[PDB]
Structure formats: structure tokens, C-alpha cells
Amino acid sequence: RSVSGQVVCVTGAGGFIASWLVKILLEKGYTVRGTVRNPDDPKNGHLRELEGAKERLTLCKADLLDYQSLREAINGCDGVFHTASPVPEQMVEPAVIGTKNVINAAAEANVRRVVFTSSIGAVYMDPNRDPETVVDETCWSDPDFCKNTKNWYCYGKMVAEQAAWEEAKEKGVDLVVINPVLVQGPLLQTTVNASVLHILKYLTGSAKTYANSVQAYVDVKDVALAHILLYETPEASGRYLCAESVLHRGDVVEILSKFFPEYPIPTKCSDVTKPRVKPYKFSNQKLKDLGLEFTPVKQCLYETVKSLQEKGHLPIP
Numbered sequence: 001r002s003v004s005g006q007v008v009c010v011t012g013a014g015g016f017i018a019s020w021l022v023k024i025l026l027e028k029g030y031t032v033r034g035t036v037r038n039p040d041d042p043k044n045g046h047l048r049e050l051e052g053a054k055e056r057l058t059l060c061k062a063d064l065l066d067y068q069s070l071r072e073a074i075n076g077c078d079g080v081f082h083t084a085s086p087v088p089e090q091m092v093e094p095a096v097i098g099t100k101n102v103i104n105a106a107a108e109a110n111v112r113r114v115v116f117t118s119s120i121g122a123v124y125m126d127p128n129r130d131p132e133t134v135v136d137e138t139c140w141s142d143p144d145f146c147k148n149t150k151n152w153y154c155y156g157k158m159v160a161e162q163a164a165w166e167e168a169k170e171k172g173v174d175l176v177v178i179n180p181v182l183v184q185g186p187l188l189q190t191t192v193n194a195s196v197l198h199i200l201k202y203l204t205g206s207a208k209t210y211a212n213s214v215q216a217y218v219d220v221k222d223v224a225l226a227h228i229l230l231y232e233t234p235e236a237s238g239r240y241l242c243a244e245s246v247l248h249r250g251d252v253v254e255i256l257s258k259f260f261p262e263y264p265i266p267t268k269c270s271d272v273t274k275p276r277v278k279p280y281k282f283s284n285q286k287l288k289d290l291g292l293e294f295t296p297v298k299q300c301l302y303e304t305v306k307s308l309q310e311k312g313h314l315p316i317p
Contacts, residue, residue: 210270
């Protein structure tokens with residue numbers, strides 16, 4: 001009831017993280033202006049059906065490359081959640097233009113705070129960092145290294161966040177950054193987004209083996225709540241790593257097989273020669289200290305599968 005009449009913009013509202021963010025904002029009583037490239041497109045239908053959306057969700061047609069469209073969405077907002085930073089090497093250029101546009105429009109509209117959705121891609125890849133060093137918010141990825149190794153995801157995410165800070169400092173905008181890892185969780189959309197596809201291949205039996213590698217995971221609802229916490233907490237500042245666990249692919253398939261023995265999940269690693277890659281260490285203490293409670297990765301994977309079943313992407317025996 002406290003936030004009634006508060007107006008916030010969420011860019012790229014139809015995305016995985018963004019859809020959950022809109023959902024929860026609406027539940028907490030916010031008025032939400034969500035940007036999508038085509039409001040009348042059926043793929044945004046899920047947004048219009050969210051609790052509170054009829055009364056309090058305005059879907060604004062905007063494109064990150066179209067400054068006036070963004071100004072029209074952002075004008076009259078108290079806050080902006082810039083979640084759309086699309087990163088082929090193709091992704092690198094536009095995430096930067098959009099970020100600059102959004103920050104500049106926020107500045108002109110005298111927005112109180114912008115929360116920018118960055119990524120682990122802006123944090124992890126640094127060849128000059130000791131592999132035993134705990135990964136935290138002081139860690140930035142090395143763009144020269146990512147460019148040279150053709151890791152365009154890392155390159156684009158790093159330069160987009162770098163651009164965000166530079167533009168916010170230049171225009172005097174209060175910017176806070178969240179850095180999610182690989183996000184999993186239940187689907188609001190009818191279609192499966194790219195991150196959840198990572199799990200689907202195991203459950204359909206398309207993946208006959210699992211790879212020798214590790215990744216950090218986090219629940220999508222935690223990520224959404226964290227965005228809100230960063231917006232609402234006056235003392236929030238800087239970047240915030242949003243991750244719950246680092247798992248080997250093997251740990252992931254083990255978790256899935258124990259919960260869902262009925263599916264053709266792979267049991268063998270593709271690499272039988274080199275030793276198992278070890279999970280790296282990280283700290284999510286900065287977000288915990290703000291009061292965020294993290295959903296265990298096991299629960300998150302469980303809920304992801306149950307949602308895939310519910311949405312007709314997996315059979316229910």
C-alpha cells in the first residue's frame with residue numbers, strides 16, 4: 001500500500017527476468033510501464049493477463065534504438081529497470097546504444113534511480129585473476145581478452161555495463177547494477193526462453209552426454225525480487241552479484257535424474273580424459289546483507305521442470 005501511485009518502467013518486459021519482475025512489481029502495488037517492440041504481438045499476451053495488469057500495466061511500444069520511444073515510456077516514472085541489453089558478435093553494439101538511450105531518458109525525466117540488469121559476463125572472464133580468488137562484485141571481466149577469444153557474450157556484457165556507469169556518472173543518475181548468472185525457474189511465457197533450454201535438452205534425451213564444465217545458477221524469482229530490493233533500498237550502491245550455487249553439468253543432471261527418474265537424462269560425461277572442472281568460489285554476501293534470501297538451486301531446477309510439464313514441453317507420466 002506504501003508504493004501505490006509509484007510508477008516504474010521495465011524495459012523489454014516480455015523477457016524471462018523482466019516478465020517475473022513485472023509480475024512481482026504489480027503484486028506489490030506498483031504502476032508499471034513495460035516496453036516491448038510490438039504490444040499487439042501475441043507473445044506479450046502473458047503480460048496482459050498478470051494480476052493487476054489490466055489496472056496498472058501499460059505496455060509501451062519502444063525500441064532500444066529509438067530514443068523518443070524510450071522517452072515516452074520513461075517520462076513520468078519514478079524508477080527504471082533497464083533489463084533489456086541484447087547481446088553472434090551482433091549483440092555487442094546495440095546493448096550499448098540502448099543503455100545510453102535509457103540512462104539519458106531517465107536523466108531527462110528526473111527519475112530517482114535506474115536499476116540496470118548486467119550479467120556474470122561482465123564479471124568472470126579475466127585471465128589475470130587468480131582462479132582461486134573468490135569471485136565477487138570487485139571482479140570485472142577483461143574485454144580485450146574476451147574480444148581476442150571471440151567470447152562476444154562476455155565482451156558485450158562488459159562494455160554495456162561499462163557504458164551504463166559512464167553514462168550515469170556523466171548525467172548524474174543514481175544507477176545500481178545487478179549481475180545475475182544463469183537464471184532458471186518457472187515460465188510465464190508459452191515458449192521456452194534461452195536459459196531454460198539449457199535444462200530442456202537433458203530432459204528430452206537430446207543430450208546423450210553432459211559436458212565437463214561448471215556454471216553458476218540462480219532462481220528467476222530471486223533475481224526479480226533482488227531488482228526490487230535494489231530499487232527500494234536507499235543505501236543500495238554499486239553492483240550486486242546474484243548467484244546461488246556453482247554446479248558442474250554432472251551435478252545438474254544428477255539433481256534432475258533423482259527428481260525425475262522417468263526422463264532420458266544423460267548419465268555420462270562427454271569428456272572422459274581430462275579431470276572434472278571444479279566449481280569456482282564466489283560471494284553473494286552483498287545481496288544477502290540487504291536481506292535477500294536465495295532459493296536453493298535444487299528447488300529452482302525442480303520448479304523449472306514442473307513448469308515445463310505444465311506448459312506442455314515435457315510429458316507427464
